Amino acid sequence: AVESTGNAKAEAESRAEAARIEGEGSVLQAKLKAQALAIETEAELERVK
Amino acid sequence: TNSQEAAAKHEAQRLEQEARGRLERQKILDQSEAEKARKELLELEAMSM
Numbered sequence: 540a541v542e543s544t545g546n547a548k549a550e551a552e553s554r555a556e557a558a559r560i561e562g563e564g565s566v567l568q569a570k571l572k573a574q575a576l577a578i579e580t581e582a583e584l585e586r587v588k
Numbered sequence: 589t590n591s592q593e594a595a596a597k598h599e600a601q602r603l604e605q606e607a608r609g610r611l612e613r614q615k616i617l618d619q620s621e622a623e624k625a626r627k628e629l630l631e632l633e634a635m636s637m
Contacts, residue, residue: 541627541630541631541634542630542633542634544634545630545631545633545634545635545637546634546637548634549634549637
C-alpha cells in the first residue's frame with residue numbers, strides 16, 4: 540500500500556509541479572505577450588491611422 | 589523391542605514435527621520484522637522517488 544501510494548504520489552506531485560511552473564510561466568509569458576501585442580497594435584494603429 | 593522401535597521412531601517423528609512447526613513459526617516472525625523494516629524502507633524509497 541505504502542509502495543503503490545508512494546509512487547503514485549510521486550508521479551502525481553510531479554504533474555502538480557509541472558502544472559505549477561506551467562501556470563506561473565504561462566502567467567508571465569502571457570503578460571509579456573500582452574505588452575508586446577499592446578505596443579505592436581499601438582504603433583500599428585498609429586501608422587495605419 | 590520392535591514396539592520400542594516403532595515407539596522411538598514415531599516419537600522422533602513427533603519431535604521432528606514440533607521442530608518444523610516451531611522453526612516455521614520463527615520464519616514467520618522474521619518475515620514480520622523484516623516486513624516492518626521493509627515498510628520503513630519503502631517510506632524512504634517512496635520519498636526518494
